[PDB]
Design a protein around this ligand. Sequence first.
Ligand SMILES: [K+]
Ligand SMILES: [K+]
Ligand SMILES: [K+]
Ligand SMILES: [K+]
Ligand SMILES: [K+]
Ligand SMILES: [K+]
Ligand SMILES: [Mg+2]
Ligand SMILES: [Mg+2]
Ligand SMILES: [Mg+2]
Ligand SMILES: [Mg+2]
Ligand SMILES: [Mg+2]
Ligand SMILES: [Mg+2]
Ligand SMILES: [Mg+2]
Ligand SMILES: [Mg+2]
Ligand SMILES: [Mg+2]
Ligand SMILES: [Mg+2]
Ligand SMILES: [Mg+2]
Ligand SMILES: [Mg+2]
Ligand SMILES: [Mg+2]
Ligand SMILES: [Mg+2]
Ligand SMILES: [Mg+2]
Ligand SMILES: [Mg+2]
Ligand SMILES: [Mg+2]
Ligand SMILES: [Mg+2]
Ligand SMILES: [Mg+2]
Ligand SMILES: [Mg+2]
Ligand SMILES: [Mg+2]
Ligand SMILES: [Mg+2]
Ligand SMILES: [Mg+2]
Ligand SMILES: [Mg+2]
Ligand SMILES: [Mg+2]
Ligand SMILES: [Mg+2]
Ligand SMILES: [Zn+2]
Lengths: 43, 38, 38, 122, 18, 162, 101, 51, 60, 222
Amino acid sequence: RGRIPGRQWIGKHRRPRFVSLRAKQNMIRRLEIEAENHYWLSM
Amino acid sequence: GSKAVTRHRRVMHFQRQKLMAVTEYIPPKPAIHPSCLP
Amino acid sequence: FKNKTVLKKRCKDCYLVKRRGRWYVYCKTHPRHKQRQM
Amino acid sequence: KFTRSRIPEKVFQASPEDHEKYGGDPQNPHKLHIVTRIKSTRRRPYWEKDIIKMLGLEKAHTPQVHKNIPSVNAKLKVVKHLIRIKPLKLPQGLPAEENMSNTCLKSTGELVVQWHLKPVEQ
Amino acid sequence: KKSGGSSKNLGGKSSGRR
Amino acid sequence: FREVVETQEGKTTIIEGRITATPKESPNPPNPSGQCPICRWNLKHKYNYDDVLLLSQFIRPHGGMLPRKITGLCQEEHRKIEECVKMAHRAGLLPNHRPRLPEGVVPKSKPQLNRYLTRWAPGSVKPIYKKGPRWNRVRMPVGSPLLRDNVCYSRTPWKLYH
Amino acid sequence: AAALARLGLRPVKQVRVQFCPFEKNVESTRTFLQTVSSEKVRSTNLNCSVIADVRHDGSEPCVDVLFGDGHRLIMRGAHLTALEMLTAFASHIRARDAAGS
Amino acid sequence: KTSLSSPPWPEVVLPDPVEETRHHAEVVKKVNEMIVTGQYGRLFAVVHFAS
Amino acid sequence: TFRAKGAAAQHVNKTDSAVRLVHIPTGLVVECQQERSQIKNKEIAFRVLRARLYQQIIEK
Amino acid sequence: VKTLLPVPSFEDVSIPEKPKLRFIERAPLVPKVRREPKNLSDIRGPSTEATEFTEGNFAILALGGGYLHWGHFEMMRLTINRSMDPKNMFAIWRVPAPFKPITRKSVGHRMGGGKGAIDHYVTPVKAGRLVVEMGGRCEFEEVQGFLDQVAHKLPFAAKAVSRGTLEKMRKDQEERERNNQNPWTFERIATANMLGIRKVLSPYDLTHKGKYWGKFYMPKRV
RNA sequence: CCCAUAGUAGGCCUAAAAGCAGCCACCAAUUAAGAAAGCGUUCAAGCUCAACACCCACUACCUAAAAAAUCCCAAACAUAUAA
RNA sequence: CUCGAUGUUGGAUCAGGACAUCCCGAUGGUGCAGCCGCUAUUAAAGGUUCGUUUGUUCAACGAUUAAAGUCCUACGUGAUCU
Ligand SMILES: [K+]
Ligand SMILES: [K+]
Ligand SMILES: [K+]
Ligand SMILES: [K+]
Ligand SMILES: [K+]
Ligand SMILES: [K+]
Ligand SMILES: [Mg+2]
Ligand SMILES: [Mg+2]
Ligand SMILES: [Mg+2]
Ligand SMILES: [Mg+2]
Ligand SMILES: [Mg+2]
Ligand SMILES: [Mg+2]
Ligand SMILES: [Mg+2]
Ligand SMILES: [Mg+2]
Ligand SMILES: [Mg+2]
Ligand SMILES: [Mg+2]
Ligand SMILES: [Mg+2]
Ligand SMILES: [Mg+2]
Ligand SMILES: [Mg+2]
Ligand SMILES: [Mg+2]
Ligand SMILES: [Mg+2]
Ligand SMILES: [Mg+2]
Ligand SMILES: [Mg+2]
Ligand SMILES: [Mg+2]
Ligand SMILES: [Mg+2]
Ligand SMILES: [Mg+2]
Ligand SMILES: [Mg+2]
Ligand SMILES: [Mg+2]
Ligand SMILES: [Mg+2]
Ligand SMILES: [Mg+2]
Ligand SMILES: [Mg+2]
Ligand SMILES: [Mg+2]
Ligand SMILES: [Zn+2]
């Protein structure tokens, strides 16, 4: 009974997507790597 | 597609959506709750 | 009863009580003041 | 419009707190970089694809050594989100002609000039 | 289906002068 | 505590009050500086609905909750204990604190459904006829949100909605 | 006072309040006296006599209520609160009135 | 003592390293004596060959 | 809103182009089906209704 | 013995000769003939004008972007004038009369055929802009009753504020950014192009810093 | 929660305006109570609030719902050391 | 999406479903005396007429009925019919 009008991931009405716990951790893990890259480019 | 300004809250890109979740405000947490101290 | 999204007491005799999982307004003085949470 | 990004120079100014966290010495900067690509160039603009080729980072997870000079760092700043930058460490100094064939790059960034494949007797 | 109006602005099709 | 006794002798009603034995707090609390009984014994965030030994100290003989002023609990822990007592009653962990019944009233037989961590009163919850899509699923709450800060010995946090 | 005024003092004949003001366990009895001695409560039945007896004998406070039916209500406020005595006093009024009528 | 006062897993006390070092030597000597006297039958091995 | 009348191929068989307007206080009924669009019919049906009720108020 | 406190005196506050809100017209005195583009950026981002009190002490703060047409002005003018006390209160407009032309095509027309004719005029309002400012011989509680009523009828999120509440609101936000324990912030990541995040962000996000999304303002973002 | 007397129905206007249709003043009796904040009366009565007394009510002052047409929709789980 | 064809009104036939309930059931409020009504909550098991004119869907009108419900179903259904 619950259907997304049109295609799911495109359009004015989209199927909502939610950030999981591991999705945040993966982004934070890559953020830490790039933060250390900023330090080594400063000298 | 939709324009930059819309009447409804436009669905964010997933890359942007993960950025918003990561950068949320985290209030400081005291080691001991103030109501438990004299 | 009248379904309402915001419950307000219409006089001093109205009292808020939570019954059957939703809030109600009851008034013995003025029964027309009775409201039901929607 | 999506264009190239101008990173402010304030980003690349290390604070004293950063030095303690990463252990670097501002008065004795590391001579060489250890650049490893950890992200794909796909779904990235073409100018990032070209710079990766210029730096010899076509294959991911393959360490590459580059000089710590402003011109090389300028290219790194463009693709800093696709790479891991580590300083090259020389516990026994630069390799010599005698020990050229006995070198190994450890995961700690140290280039050891002797590699015996034997446990330590200590 | 209704018959619509017409644009009253003409010209302005010049190319860039380089 | 204090009790009230009503006696009728010679068609005369006499109401009297007497003082019974009053329990005292155990000596030398580990945290004397605590402002409420829960944190004076380092029990904050360290009890659940099934810890009836702790919960029975803050309830009336018929199962009702005691006032916060009398017990001296803080507002935060008073609500935690109040919800834990409700879940204990619904789980059948307090058989000796049943509601008072007037004379001549015998409850009828009712189906026995074992339950625990019951947040809401069973008689006031509607069935989930339409679960909904995966992105808007109607969940079944388990436990109470006031116990979210309890010390969790597992890496996975408490799932308050099933 | 307001709650007691609604019920009234029709089935009550005489209310006697005995307490020792110099004691430390007569505050509840005095509070009961204030509620009963209110103009609203006394106006419900002018045939009901409210008597306040003050003694220095050291005896515990006592409240004696006499109804028209002849039954007596005695509430000892030494270890009772004013609210509890009022509720017991109101309950007897609601019952003695029904028996008489 | 409440349900959350102590961790659910039972406490584990590791042996004293000074005492356990002596215990390890006894076990190694016991197994070594088996090889000297040939107190073993068929032997199976796990070898790393061709990746 | 209701389907029009006339020799007009398939458009009427599915499209409710005709508009009927009834003024409850006066009981006047105005119908218009000249135009293919209901909105075009609705506006003219209003205009006839306005004109007819303009006379009624004059008569009133 | 109940402890009393001194009350403030308003005897030094003067009241203008026209305390009530002036009438606002649908269209300017001279109608505009040059049709203007949509220009959605006029309601996007923080407001750089009418963000501070001028004469009054109480006002309605706009918490989002939107357009005000003549219907909204009549709602504001009628409610405020009726619910105010002219002898002790006065109200002024902090927004201009509707001036931005809005074009509507004829109903039922297909796409094309030029641009539609001008239909009405609206006033663009950004987040953080005062709409109506009030003041005089009154407290905030007296005027907060109907200002919040008007605020919830606006097309954008709004809230009645005072000189003290608005200062507290701004100082609270500054405190939130100061004690934020999150090592990662939207401003730091966006400006530094960390993770190549600017490929999915907007150039305006360098200055909005994640606090604004379209016409919406999020006070909880730090 | 508890409790409410009085100069006085202030003056003016008004057929009448008595705290509560308008206008002006907004002083004063009592330890304590506004020439009256909300209801009400044709005008008055009448019911509350702001008073005193009693006394640790020792309050939060941040918010809100739902409906479609073949048949809900993985099954389940709040507890054993973050991998 | 379909023009190397997915056959259009309305009717007949058979109806499936939604409830935003026309009738029947259970309730709250009333400017609910009663008899009739108005409004709201709940309820989709059951039922929801025959005719004159018009190709009609409608609408008007006649006589009734506890009531003559609103919609979806490729504007339900033409390898069933007209
Ligand atoms: K879509
Ligand atoms: K709004
Ligand atoms: K008057
Ligand atoms: K075709
Ligand atoms: K049916
Ligand atoms: K015919
Ligand atoms: Mg689809
Ligand atoms: Mg676009
Ligand atoms: Mg040009
Ligand atoms: Mg050109
Ligand atoms: Mg030229
Ligand atoms: Mg709950
Ligand atoms: Mg023809
Ligand atoms: Mg033709
Ligand atoms: Mg007076
Ligand atoms: Mg007067
Ligand atoms: Mg009057
Ligand atoms: Mg006045
Ligand atoms: Mg009076
Ligand atoms: Mg009072
Ligand atoms: Mg299933
Ligand atoms: Mg599966
Ligand atoms: Mg074919
Ligand atoms: Mg048919
Ligand atoms: Mg059917
Ligand atoms: Mg229903
Ligand atoms: Mg339903
Ligand atoms: Mg039936
Ligand atoms: Mg009734
Ligand atoms: Mg069909
Ligand atoms: Mg067929
Ligand atoms: Mg057919
Ligand atoms: Zn009421």
